[PDB]
């Protein structure tokens, strides 16, 4: 049942943590696709965005605000990209909701 | 473009097809409040931002994206942000690659 993010959350797998509160955790991606690449994850183990529900509204907004706050802290003033992958066609890696934040280089278009 | 290209509307947001699609399904979720960039959202926007994500995933289901899809928000020049109003892109109907641009 638990994904590897369970170890990130319980600190049994050391990670470069940029932000933490009782709702979420932000840590660097160890397979980075940009000079800055971090993940914002809820502590509630919502597996994918398609499985979020109305009761998650506050949490989801909080994740976006934390993403943009952390982007500022990481010096992404010239721009960045937020990405959420759902399921196989979305190339979702781990089945625990995560927002990717990529910056520090020019992002291309299309976005994959 | 036609009125039916607005896939969803409420007092908080509008959802409409992208006329320069990058996938067989490609639509855009925008707030009615004119937040220019995600980097300029503020704490007061918490509920609105969560609503936009829920609307994105609800509309993805309505558009038949049951095998996966991708949400993208671009900020500024390095993000390739193309209009200075907040847009959540939703892309589906094909395999999305990695990296995401
Ligand atoms: Cl954009």
PDB file of N, CA, C and O in Angstrom, chain A residues 33 37 49-50 52-54 57-58 60-62 64-65 68-69 77-91 100 102 105-112, chain B residues 22 26 37-39 41-43 45-47 49-51 53-54 57-58 67-80 89 91 94-101:
ATOM      1  N   UNK A  33      14.731  17.326 -13.307  1.00  0.00           N
ATOM      2  CA  UNK A  33      14.577  17.603 -14.725  1.00  0.00           C
ATOM      3  C   UNK A  33      14.846  19.074 -15.030  1.00  0.00           C
ATOM      4  O   UNK A  33      14.648  19.518 -16.163  1.00  0.00           O
ATOM      5  N   UNK A  37      14.199  21.602  -9.038  1.00  0.00           N
ATOM      6  CA  UNK A  37      13.089  20.684  -9.243  1.00  0.00           C
ATOM      7  C   UNK A  37      12.713  20.104  -7.892  1.00  0.00           C
ATOM      8  O   UNK A  37      13.468  19.328  -7.300  1.00  0.00           O
ATOM      9  N   UNK A  49      -4.621  13.238  -8.532  1.00  0.00           N
ATOM     10  CA  UNK A  49      -5.519  14.384  -8.562  1.00  0.00           C
ATOM     11  C   UNK A  49      -6.953  14.000  -8.975  1.00  0.00           C
ATOM     12  O   UNK A  49      -7.908  14.595  -8.503  1.00  0.00           O
ATOM     13  N   UNK A  50      -7.092  12.982  -9.822  1.00  0.00           N
ATOM     14  CA  UNK A  50      -8.418  12.536 -10.239  1.00  0.00           C
ATOM     15  C   UNK A  50      -9.227  11.955  -9.080  1.00  0.00           C
ATOM     16  O   UNK A  50     -10.449  11.816  -9.190  1.00  0.00           O
ATOM     17  N   UNK A  52      -9.015  13.332  -5.906  1.00  0.00           N
ATOM     18  CA  UNK A  52      -9.293  14.381  -4.932  1.00  0.00           C
ATOM     19  C   UNK A  52     -10.799  14.629  -4.920  1.00  0.00           C
ATOM     20  O   UNK A  52     -11.496  14.337  -5.903  1.00  0.00           O
ATOM     21  N   UNK A  53     -11.302  15.154  -3.810  1.00  0.00           N
ATOM     22  CA  UNK A  53     -12.733  15.412  -3.678  1.00  0.00           C
ATOM     23  C   UNK A  53     -12.966  16.793  -3.093  1.00  0.00           C
ATOM     24  O   UNK A  53     -12.017  17.482  -2.727  1.00  0.00           O
ATOM     25  N   UNK A  54     -14.228  17.198  -2.991  1.00  0.00           N
ATOM     26  CA  UNK A  54     -14.553  18.547  -2.544  1.00  0.00           C
ATOM     27  C   UNK A  54     -13.988  18.864  -1.162  1.00  0.00           C
ATOM     28  O   UNK A  54     -13.619  20.002  -0.882  1.00  0.00           O
ATOM     29  N   UNK A  57     -10.595  20.699  -0.993  1.00  0.00           N
ATOM     30  CA  UNK A  57     -10.438  22.009  -1.611  1.00  0.00           C
ATOM     31  C   UNK A  57      -9.404  22.905  -0.918  1.00  0.00           C
ATOM     32  O   UNK A  57      -8.523  23.479  -1.572  1.00  0.00           O
ATOM     33  N   UNK A  58      -9.519  23.026   0.404  1.00  0.00           N
ATOM     34  CA  UNK A  58      -8.597  23.855   1.161  1.00  0.00           C
ATOM     35  C   UNK A  58      -7.160  23.350   1.024  1.00  0.00           C
ATOM     36  O   UNK A  58      -6.230  24.131   0.797  1.00  0.00           O
ATOM     37  N   UNK A  60      -5.837  21.515  -1.365  1.00  0.00           N
ATOM     38  CA  UNK A  60      -5.324  21.712  -2.723  1.00  0.00           C
ATOM     39  C   UNK A  60      -4.860  23.141  -2.953  1.00  0.00           C
ATOM     40  O   UNK A  60      -3.805  23.371  -3.541  1.00  0.00           O
ATOM     41  N   UNK A  61      -5.636  24.108  -2.479  1.00  0.00           N
ATOM     42  CA  UNK A  61      -5.216  25.489  -2.575  1.00  0.00           C
ATOM     43  C   UNK A  61      -3.947  25.753  -1.784  1.00  0.00           C
ATOM     44  O   UNK A  61      -3.069  26.485  -2.224  1.00  0.00           O
ATOM     45  N   UNK A  62      -3.866  25.165  -0.594  1.00  0.00           N
ATOM     46  CA  UNK A  62      -2.675  25.287   0.229  1.00  0.00           C
ATOM     47  C   UNK A  62      -1.439  24.737  -0.495  1.00  0.00           C
ATOM     48  O   UNK A  62      -0.372  25.338  -0.441  1.00  0.00           O
ATOM     49  N   UNK A  64      -0.869  24.641  -3.696  1.00  0.00           N
ATOM     50  CA  UNK A  64      -0.461  25.604  -4.717  1.00  0.00           C
ATOM     51  C   UNK A  64       0.234  26.827  -4.119  1.00  0.00           C
ATOM     52  O   UNK A  64       1.212  27.325  -4.661  1.00  0.00           O
ATOM     53  N   UNK A  65      -0.302  27.330  -3.004  1.00  0.00           N
ATOM     54  CA  UNK A  65       0.313  28.475  -2.340  1.00  0.00           C
ATOM     55  C   UNK A  65       1.705  28.136  -1.808  1.00  0.00           C
ATOM     56  O   UNK A  65       2.639  28.930  -1.935  1.00  0.00           O
ATOM     57  N   UNK A  68       4.131  28.078  -4.763  1.00  0.00           N
ATOM     58  CA  UNK A  68       4.600  29.374  -5.240  1.00  0.00           C
ATOM     59  C   UNK A  68       5.473  30.088  -4.195  1.00  0.00           C
ATOM     60  O   UNK A  68       6.431  30.765  -4.555  1.00  0.00           O
ATOM     61  N   UNK A  69       5.169  29.903  -2.913  1.00  0.00           N
ATOM     62  CA  UNK A  69       6.014  30.473  -1.864  1.00  0.00           C
ATOM     63  C   UNK A  69       7.414  29.870  -1.915  1.00  0.00           C
ATOM     64  O   UNK A  69       8.421  30.571  -1.772  1.00  0.00           O
ATOM     65  N   UNK A  77      12.441  33.721  -9.643  1.00  0.00           N
ATOM     66  CA  UNK A  77      11.826  34.977 -10.050  1.00  0.00           C
ATOM     67  C   UNK A  77      11.642  35.188 -11.542  1.00  0.00           C
ATOM     68  O   UNK A  77      10.742  35.918 -11.945  1.00  0.00           O
ATOM     69  N   UNK A  78      12.467  34.564 -12.370  1.00  0.00           N
ATOM     70  CA  UNK A  78      12.354  34.732 -13.816  1.00  0.00           C
ATOM     71  C   UNK A  78      11.336  33.773 -14.443  1.00  0.00           C
ATOM     72  O   UNK A  78      11.128  33.787 -15.654  1.00  0.00           O
ATOM     73  N   UNK A  79      10.723  32.926 -13.613  1.00  0.00           N
ATOM     74  CA  UNK A  79       9.663  32.042 -14.069  1.00  0.00           C
ATOM     75  C   UNK A  79       9.899  30.586 -13.716  1.00  0.00           C
ATOM     76  O   UNK A  79      11.006  30.189 -13.347  1.00  0.00           O
ATOM     77  N   UNK A  80       8.849  29.781 -13.843  1.00  0.00           N
ATOM     78  CA  UNK A  80       8.885  28.380 -13.469  1.00  0.00           C
ATOM     79  C   UNK A  80       7.618  27.707 -13.973  1.00  0.00           C
ATOM     80  O   UNK A  80       6.734  28.357 -14.538  1.00  0.00           O
ATOM     81  N   UNK A  81       7.536  26.401 -13.762  1.00  0.00           N
ATOM     82  CA  UNK A  81       6.380  25.626 -14.181  1.00  0.00           C
ATOM     83  C   UNK A  81       5.959  24.667 -13.085  1.00  0.00           C
ATOM     84  O   UNK A  81       6.802  24.038 -12.439  1.00  0.00           O
ATOM     85  N   UNK A  82       4.649  24.583 -12.875  1.00  0.00           N
ATOM     86  CA  UNK A  82       4.041  23.618 -11.973  1.00  0.00           C
ATOM     87  C   UNK A  82       3.390  22.531 -12.809  1.00  0.00           C
ATOM     88  O   UNK A  82       2.698  22.823 -13.793  1.00  0.00           O
ATOM     89  N   UNK A  83       3.586  21.276 -12.419  1.00  0.00           N
ATOM     90  CA  UNK A  83       3.040  20.141 -13.165  1.00  0.00           C
ATOM     91  C   UNK A  83       2.445  19.102 -12.230  1.00  0.00           C
ATOM     92  O   UNK A  83       3.082  18.721 -11.240  1.00  0.00           O
ATOM     93  N   UNK A  84       1.228  18.651 -12.529  1.00  0.00           N
ATOM     94  CA  UNK A  84       0.631  17.530 -11.813  1.00  0.00           C
ATOM     95  C   UNK A  84       0.305  16.463 -12.845  1.00  0.00           C
ATOM     96  O   UNK A  84      -0.405  16.728 -13.823  1.00  0.00           O
ATOM     97  N   UNK A  85       0.855  15.272 -12.645  1.00  0.00           N
ATOM     98  CA  UNK A  85       0.610  14.140 -13.531  1.00  0.00           C
ATOM     99  C   UNK A  85      -0.437  13.218 -12.934  1.00  0.00           C
ATOM    100  O   UNK A  85      -0.341  12.851 -11.750  1.00  0.00           O
ATOM    101  N   UNK A  86      -1.440  12.851 -13.732  1.00  0.00           N
ATOM    102  CA  UNK A  86      -2.429  11.858 -13.330  1.00  0.00           C
ATOM    103  C   UNK A  86      -2.319  10.601 -14.187  1.00  0.00           C
ATOM    104  O   UNK A  86      -2.348  10.674 -15.411  1.00  0.00           O
ATOM    105  N   UNK A  87      -2.195   9.445 -13.538  1.00  0.00           N
ATOM    106  CA  UNK A  87      -2.262   8.164 -14.221  1.00  0.00           C
ATOM    107  C   UNK A  87      -1.184   7.873 -15.243  1.00  0.00           C
ATOM    108  O   UNK A  87      -0.171   8.564 -15.343  1.00  0.00           O
ATOM    109  N   UNK A  88      -1.417   6.823 -16.026  1.00  0.00           N
ATOM    110  CA  UNK A  88      -0.393   6.323 -16.926  1.00  0.00           C
ATOM    111  C   UNK A  88      -0.112   7.274 -18.081  1.00  0.00           C
ATOM    112  O   UNK A  88       1.046   7.534 -18.391  1.00  0.00           O
ATOM    113  N   UNK A  89      -1.163   7.788 -18.716  1.00  0.00           N
ATOM    114  CA  UNK A  89      -0.955   8.704 -19.834  1.00  0.00           C
ATOM    115  C   UNK A  89      -0.356  10.031 -19.376  1.00  0.00           C
ATOM    116  O   UNK A  89       0.273  10.720 -20.166  1.00  0.00           O
ATOM    117  N   UNK A  90      -0.533  10.373 -18.099  1.00  0.00           N
ATOM    118  CA  UNK A  90       0.095  11.569 -17.550  1.00  0.00           C
ATOM    119  C   UNK A  90       1.545  11.362 -17.143  1.00  0.00           C
ATOM    120  O   UNK A  90       2.226  12.320 -16.769  1.00  0.00           O
ATOM    121  N   UNK A  91       2.009  10.113 -17.204  1.00  0.00           N
ATOM    122  CA  UNK A  91       3.342   9.732 -16.732  1.00  0.00           C
ATOM    123  C   UNK A  91       3.516   9.905 -15.223  1.00  0.00           C
ATOM    124  O   UNK A  91       4.604  10.235 -14.743  1.00  0.00           O
ATOM    125  N   UNK A 100       4.957  18.957  -9.108  1.00  0.00           N
ATOM    126  CA  UNK A 100       6.323  19.255  -9.515  1.00  0.00           C
ATOM    127  C   UNK A 100       6.478  20.749  -9.690  1.00  0.00           C
ATOM    128  O   UNK A 100       5.610  21.398 -10.281  1.00  0.00           O
ATOM    129  N   UNK A 102       9.398  23.193 -11.393  1.00  0.00           N
ATOM    130  CA  UNK A 102      10.624  23.200 -12.188  1.00  0.00           C
ATOM    131  C   UNK A 102      11.016  24.621 -12.527  1.00  0.00           C
ATOM    132  O   UNK A 102      10.190  25.398 -12.991  1.00  0.00           O
ATOM    133  N   UNK A 105      15.833  27.058 -15.669  1.00  0.00           N
ATOM    134  CA  UNK A 105      16.123  26.997 -17.099  1.00  0.00           C
ATOM    135  C   UNK A 105      14.860  27.405 -17.842  1.00  0.00           C
ATOM    136  O   UNK A 105      13.777  27.480 -17.253  1.00  0.00           O
ATOM    137  N   UNK A 106      14.984  27.656 -19.137  1.00  0.00           N
ATOM    138  CA  UNK A 106      13.818  27.867 -19.977  1.00  0.00           C
ATOM    139  C   UNK A 106      13.032  26.564 -20.100  1.00  0.00           C
ATOM    140  O   UNK A 106      13.596  25.530 -20.463  1.00  0.00           O
ATOM    141  N   UNK A 107      11.743  26.606 -19.788  1.00  0.00           N
ATOM    142  CA  UNK A 107      10.855  25.472 -20.027  1.00  0.00           C
ATOM    143  C   UNK A 107      10.299  25.565 -21.448  1.00  0.00           C
ATOM    144  O   UNK A 107      10.005  26.663 -21.942  1.00  0.00           O
ATOM    145  N   UNK A 108      10.181  24.415 -22.104  1.00  0.00           N
ATOM    146  CA  UNK A 108       9.784  24.345 -23.499  1.00  0.00           C
ATOM    147  C   UNK A 108       8.273  24.155 -23.647  1.00  0.00           C
ATOM    148  O   UNK A 108       7.545  24.022 -22.651  1.00  0.00           O
ATOM    149  N   UNK A 109       7.797  24.146 -24.883  1.00  0.00           N
ATOM    150  CA  UNK A 109       6.379  23.945 -25.170  1.00  0.00           C
ATOM    151  C   UNK A 109       6.324  23.121 -26.447  1.00  0.00           C
ATOM    152  O   UNK A 109       7.004  23.469 -27.420  1.00  0.00           O
ATOM    153  N   UNK A 110       5.543  22.031 -26.475  1.00  0.00           N
ATOM    154  CA  UNK A 110       4.577  21.562 -25.474  1.00  0.00           C
ATOM    155  C   UNK A 110       5.232  21.052 -24.191  1.00  0.00           C
ATOM    156  O   UNK A 110       6.436  20.767 -24.169  1.00  0.00           O
ATOM    157  N   UNK A 111       4.438  20.917 -23.120  1.00  0.00           N
ATOM    158  CA  UNK A 111       4.975  20.476 -21.832  1.00  0.00           C
ATOM    159  C   UNK A 111       4.970  18.955 -21.749  1.00  0.00           C
ATOM    160  O   UNK A 111       4.260  18.369 -20.932  1.00  0.00           O
ATOM    161  N   UNK A 112       5.769  18.323 -22.609  1.00  0.00           N
ATOM    162  CA  UNK A 112       5.717  16.881 -22.788  1.00  0.00           C
ATOM    163  C   UNK A 112       4.643  16.448 -23.773  1.00  0.00           C
ATOM    164  O   UNK A 112       4.107  17.275 -24.527  1.00  0.00           O
TER     165      UNK A 112
ATOM    166  N   UNK B  22      -2.186  21.180 -27.776  1.00  0.00           N
ATOM    167  CA  UNK B  22      -0.965  20.393 -27.784  1.00  0.00           C
ATOM    168  C   UNK B  22      -1.255  18.911 -27.539  1.00  0.00           C
ATOM    169  O   UNK B  22      -0.335  18.103 -27.396  1.00  0.00           O
ATOM    170  N   UNK B  26      -7.277  19.511 -24.874  1.00  0.00           N
ATOM    171  CA  UNK B  26      -6.444  20.544 -24.274  1.00  0.00           C
ATOM    172  C   UNK B  26      -7.342  21.718 -23.936  1.00  0.00           C
ATOM    173  O   UNK B  26      -7.859  22.408 -24.827  1.00  0.00           O
ATOM    174  N   UNK B  37      -0.626  35.887 -12.459  1.00  0.00           N
ATOM    175  CA  UNK B  37       0.415  34.854 -12.463  1.00  0.00           C
ATOM    176  C   UNK B  37       0.290  34.084 -11.156  1.00  0.00           C
ATOM    177  O   UNK B  37      -0.033  34.694 -10.133  1.00  0.00           O
ATOM    178  N   UNK B  38       0.610  32.791 -11.151  1.00  0.00           N
ATOM    179  CA  UNK B  38       0.548  32.035  -9.907  1.00  0.00           C
ATOM    180  C   UNK B  38       1.481  32.615  -8.840  1.00  0.00           C
ATOM    181  O   UNK B  38       1.169  32.575  -7.651  1.00  0.00           O
ATOM    182  N   UNK B  39       2.601  33.186  -9.264  1.00  0.00           N
ATOM    183  CA  UNK B  39       3.527  33.801  -8.316  1.00  0.00           C
ATOM    184  C   UNK B  39       2.929  35.023  -7.607  1.00  0.00           C
ATOM    185  O   UNK B  39       3.462  35.466  -6.591  1.00  0.00           O
ATOM    186  N   UNK B  41      -0.460  35.089  -6.734  1.00  0.00           N
ATOM    187  CA  UNK B  41      -1.565  34.671  -5.873  1.00  0.00           C
ATOM    188  C   UNK B  41      -1.194  34.931  -4.415  1.00  0.00           C
ATOM    189  O   UNK B  41      -0.012  35.016  -4.076  1.00  0.00           O
ATOM    190  N   UNK B  42      -2.200  35.056  -3.554  1.00  0.00           N
ATOM    191  CA  UNK B  42      -1.956  35.323  -2.140  1.00  0.00           C
ATOM    192  C   UNK B  42      -2.810  34.414  -1.278  1.00  0.00           C
ATOM    193  O   UNK B  42      -3.655  33.681  -1.790  1.00  0.00           O
ATOM    194  N   UNK B  43      -2.581  34.451   0.032  1.00  0.00           N
ATOM    195  CA  UNK B  43      -3.263  33.550   0.947  1.00  0.00           C
ATOM    196  C   UNK B  43      -4.782  33.626   0.828  1.00  0.00           C
ATOM    197  O   UNK B  43      -5.459  32.618   0.969  1.00  0.00           O
ATOM    198  N   UNK B  45      -6.457  33.725  -1.680  1.00  0.00           N
ATOM    199  CA  UNK B  45      -6.874  32.960  -2.852  1.00  0.00           C
ATOM    200  C   UNK B  45      -6.899  31.452  -2.599  1.00  0.00           C
ATOM    201  O   UNK B  45      -7.167  30.677  -3.515  1.00  0.00           O
ATOM    202  N   UNK B  46      -6.636  31.019  -1.367  1.00  0.00           N
ATOM    203  CA  UNK B  46      -6.533  29.591  -1.072  1.00  0.00           C
ATOM    204  C   UNK B  46      -7.731  28.778  -1.566  1.00  0.00           C
ATOM    205  O   UNK B  46      -7.578  27.780  -2.283  1.00  0.00           O
ATOM    206  N   UNK B  47      -8.934  29.192  -1.178  1.00  0.00           N
ATOM    207  CA  UNK B  47     -10.116  28.435  -1.572  1.00  0.00           C
ATOM    208  C   UNK B  47     -10.349  28.452  -3.086  1.00  0.00           C
ATOM    209  O   UNK B  47     -10.694  27.434  -3.674  1.00  0.00           O
ATOM    210  N   UNK B  49      -8.059  28.763  -5.441  1.00  0.00           N
ATOM    211  CA  UNK B  49      -7.051  27.923  -6.096  1.00  0.00           C
ATOM    212  C   UNK B  49      -7.410  26.445  -5.976  1.00  0.00           C
ATOM    213  O   UNK B  49      -7.277  25.681  -6.931  1.00  0.00           O
ATOM    214  N   UNK B  50      -7.896  26.035  -4.809  1.00  0.00           N
ATOM    215  CA  UNK B  50      -8.355  24.666  -4.662  1.00  0.00           C
ATOM    216  C   UNK B  50      -9.542  24.357  -5.567  1.00  0.00           C
ATOM    217  O   UNK B  50      -9.644  23.278  -6.145  1.00  0.00           O
ATOM    218  N   UNK B  51     -10.460  25.315  -5.671  1.00  0.00           N
ATOM    219  CA  UNK B  51     -11.604  25.192  -6.569  1.00  0.00           C
ATOM    220  C   UNK B  51     -11.152  25.005  -8.016  1.00  0.00           C
ATOM    221  O   UNK B  51     -11.695  24.161  -8.726  1.00  0.00           O
ATOM    222  N   UNK B  53      -8.418  23.660  -9.147  1.00  0.00           N
ATOM    223  CA  UNK B  53      -7.917  22.298  -9.318  1.00  0.00           C
ATOM    224  C   UNK B  53      -9.036  21.264  -9.355  1.00  0.00           C
ATOM    225  O   UNK B  53      -9.000  20.335 -10.155  1.00  0.00           O
ATOM    226  N   UNK B  54     -10.034  21.428  -8.491  1.00  0.00           N
ATOM    227  CA  UNK B  54     -11.176  20.516  -8.500  1.00  0.00           C
ATOM    228  C   UNK B  54     -11.954  20.614  -9.813  1.00  0.00           C
ATOM    229  O   UNK B  54     -12.353  19.596 -10.377  1.00  0.00           O
ATOM    230  N   UNK B  57      -9.990  18.793 -12.535  1.00  0.00           N
ATOM    231  CA  UNK B  57     -10.114  17.341 -12.517  1.00  0.00           C
ATOM    232  C   UNK B  57     -11.544  16.879 -12.860  1.00  0.00           C
ATOM    233  O   UNK B  57     -11.717  15.858 -13.536  1.00  0.00           O
ATOM    234  N   UNK B  58     -12.553  17.648 -12.460  1.00  0.00           N
ATOM    235  CA  UNK B  58     -13.939  17.341 -12.834  1.00  0.00           C
ATOM    236  C   UNK B  58     -14.130  17.433 -14.347  1.00  0.00           C
ATOM    237  O   UNK B  58     -14.792  16.584 -14.963  1.00  0.00           O
ATOM    238  N   UNK B  67      -7.684   7.615 -18.530  1.00  0.00           N
ATOM    239  CA  UNK B  67      -6.429   6.875 -18.537  1.00  0.00           C
ATOM    240  C   UNK B  67      -5.242   7.769 -18.179  1.00  0.00           C
ATOM    241  O   UNK B  67      -4.092   7.391 -18.361  1.00  0.00           O
ATOM    242  N   UNK B  68      -5.539   8.963 -17.675  1.00  0.00           N
ATOM    243  CA  UNK B  68      -4.506   9.885 -17.237  1.00  0.00           C
ATOM    244  C   UNK B  68      -4.443  11.157 -18.052  1.00  0.00           C
ATOM    245  O   UNK B  68      -4.967  11.220 -19.170  1.00  0.00           O
ATOM    246  N   UNK B  69      -3.798  12.176 -17.482  1.00  0.00           N
ATOM    247  CA  UNK B  69      -3.704  13.498 -18.093  1.00  0.00           C
ATOM    248  C   UNK B  69      -2.677  14.310 -17.310  1.00  0.00           C
ATOM    249  O   UNK B  69      -2.104  13.816 -16.325  1.00  0.00           O
ATOM    250  N   UNK B  70      -2.446  15.548 -17.742  1.00  0.00           N
ATOM    251  CA  UNK B  70      -1.466  16.409 -17.089  1.00  0.00           C
ATOM    252  C   UNK B  70      -2.031  17.809 -16.891  1.00  0.00           C
ATOM    253  O   UNK B  70      -2.692  18.351 -17.787  1.00  0.00           O
ATOM    254  N   UNK B  71      -1.798  18.372 -15.705  1.00  0.00           N
ATOM    255  CA  UNK B  71      -2.103  19.769 -15.405  1.00  0.00           C
ATOM    256  C   UNK B  71      -0.811  20.566 -15.416  1.00  0.00           C
ATOM    257  O   UNK B  71       0.196  20.121 -14.855  1.00  0.00           O
ATOM    258  N   UNK B  72      -0.831  21.745 -16.035  1.00  0.00           N
ATOM    259  CA  UNK B  72       0.354  22.589 -16.129  1.00  0.00           C
ATOM    260  C   UNK B  72       0.003  24.043 -15.823  1.00  0.00           C
ATOM    261  O   UNK B  72      -0.988  24.574 -16.353  1.00  0.00           O
ATOM    262  N   UNK B  73       0.794  24.682 -14.959  1.00  0.00           N
ATOM    263  CA  UNK B  73       0.704  26.124 -14.763  1.00  0.00           C
ATOM    264  C   UNK B  73       2.060  26.726 -15.062  1.00  0.00           C
ATOM    265  O   UNK B  73       3.060  26.320 -14.468  1.00  0.00           O
ATOM    266  N   UNK B  74       2.082  27.714 -15.951  1.00  0.00           N
ATOM    267  CA  UNK B  74       3.305  28.401 -16.338  1.00  0.00           C
ATOM    268  C   UNK B  74       3.391  29.754 -15.657  1.00  0.00           C
ATOM    269  O   UNK B  74       2.402  30.497 -15.653  1.00  0.00           O
ATOM    270  N   UNK B  75       4.561  30.092 -15.116  1.00  0.00           N
ATOM    271  CA  UNK B  75       4.794  31.407 -14.536  1.00  0.00           C
ATOM    272  C   UNK B  75       5.938  32.098 -15.256  1.00  0.00           C
ATOM    273  O   UNK B  75       7.031  31.536 -15.371  1.00  0.00           O
ATOM    274  N   UNK B  76       5.692  33.312 -15.740  1.00  0.00           N
ATOM    275  CA  UNK B  76       6.751  34.142 -16.288  1.00  0.00           C
ATOM    276  C   UNK B  76       7.408  33.651 -17.564  1.00  0.00           C
ATOM    277  O   UNK B  76       6.967  32.682 -18.202  1.00  0.00           O
ATOM    278  N   UNK B  77       8.492  34.323 -17.939  1.00  0.00           N
ATOM    279  CA  UNK B  77       9.141  34.022 -19.204  1.00  0.00           C
ATOM    280  C   UNK B  77       9.757  32.628 -19.226  1.00  0.00           C
ATOM    281  O   UNK B  77       9.605  31.908 -20.204  1.00  0.00           O
ATOM    282  N   UNK B  78      10.452  32.237 -18.165  1.00  0.00           N
ATOM    283  CA  UNK B  78      11.066  30.913 -18.168  1.00  0.00           C
ATOM    284  C   UNK B  78      10.024  29.797 -18.133  1.00  0.00           C
ATOM    285  O   UNK B  78      10.295  28.681 -18.568  1.00  0.00           O
ATOM    286  N   UNK B  79       8.832  30.081 -17.621  1.00  0.00           N
ATOM    287  CA  UNK B  79       7.763  29.100 -17.643  1.00  0.00           C
ATOM    288  C   UNK B  79       7.022  29.028 -18.965  1.00  0.00           C
ATOM    289  O   UNK B  79       6.167  28.151 -19.136  1.00  0.00           O
ATOM    290  N   UNK B  80       7.353  29.924 -19.894  1.00  0.00           N
ATOM    291  CA  UNK B  80       6.616  30.088 -21.149  1.00  0.00           C
ATOM    292  C   UNK B  80       5.161  30.518 -20.930  1.00  0.00           C
ATOM    293  O   UNK B  80       4.262  30.112 -21.666  1.00  0.00           O
ATOM    294  N   UNK B  89      -3.549  24.663 -17.563  1.00  0.00           N
ATOM    295  CA  UNK B  89      -3.683  23.801 -18.733  1.00  0.00           C
ATOM    296  C   UNK B  89      -4.017  22.383 -18.309  1.00  0.00           C
ATOM    297  O   UNK B  89      -3.424  21.858 -17.357  1.00  0.00           O
ATOM    298  N   UNK B  91      -4.122  18.728 -20.306  1.00  0.00           N
ATOM    299  CA  UNK B  91      -3.816  18.024 -21.546  1.00  0.00           C
ATOM    300  C   UNK B  91      -4.065  16.540 -21.391  1.00  0.00           C
ATOM    301  O   UNK B  91      -3.637  15.929 -20.404  1.00  0.00           O
ATOM    302  N   UNK B  94      -3.439  11.529 -25.210  1.00  0.00           N
ATOM    303  CA  UNK B  94      -2.229  10.923 -25.748  1.00  0.00           C
ATOM    304  C   UNK B  94      -1.285  10.682 -24.586  1.00  0.00           C
ATOM    305  O   UNK B  94      -1.527  11.164 -23.474  1.00  0.00           O
ATOM    306  N   UNK B  95      -0.229   9.917 -24.828  1.00  0.00           N
ATOM    307  CA  UNK B  95       0.802   9.753 -23.822  1.00  0.00           C
ATOM    308  C   UNK B  95       1.543  11.074 -23.685  1.00  0.00           C
ATOM    309  O   UNK B  95       1.974  11.661 -24.676  1.00  0.00           O
ATOM    310  N   UNK B  96       1.673  11.550 -22.452  1.00  0.00           N
ATOM    311  CA  UNK B  96       2.498  12.720 -22.167  1.00  0.00           C
ATOM    312  C   UNK B  96       3.909  12.240 -21.858  1.00  0.00           C
ATOM    313  O   UNK B  96       4.094  11.183 -21.235  1.00  0.00           O
ATOM    314  N   UNK B  97       4.898  13.013 -22.288  1.00  0.00           N
ATOM    315  CA  UNK B  97       6.297  12.647 -22.127  1.00  0.00           C
ATOM    316  C   UNK B  97       6.873  13.197 -20.824  1.00  0.00           C
ATOM    317  O   UNK B  97       6.223  13.975 -20.118  1.00  0.00           O
ATOM    318  N   UNK B  98       8.098  12.803 -20.512  1.00  0.00           N
ATOM    319  CA  UNK B  98       8.809  13.344 -19.364  1.00  0.00           C
ATOM    320  C   UNK B  98      10.243  13.546 -19.824  1.00  0.00           C
ATOM    321  O   UNK B  98      10.836  12.617 -20.379  1.00  0.00           O
ATOM    322  N   UNK B  99      10.829  14.730 -19.601  1.00  0.00           N
ATOM    323  CA  UNK B  99      10.355  15.893 -18.838  1.00  0.00           C
ATOM    324  C   UNK B  99       9.175  16.627 -19.480  1.00  0.00           C
ATOM    325  O   UNK B  99       8.875  16.436 -20.666  1.00  0.00           O
ATOM    326  N   UNK B 100       8.498  17.474 -18.690  1.00  0.00           N
ATOM    327  CA  UNK B 100       7.302  18.169 -19.166  1.00  0.00           C
ATOM    328  C   UNK B 100       7.674  19.517 -19.780  1.00  0.00           C
ATOM    329  O   UNK B 100       7.235  20.574 -19.312  1.00  0.00           O
ATOM    330  N   UNK B 101       8.481  19.479 -20.835  1.00  0.00           N
ATOM    331  CA  UNK B 101       9.111  20.683 -21.338  1.00  0.00           C
ATOM    332  C   UNK B 101      10.345  21.035 -20.530  1.00  0.00           C
ATOM    333  O   UNK B 101      10.932  22.101 -20.770  1.00  0.00           O
TER     334      UNK B 101
END
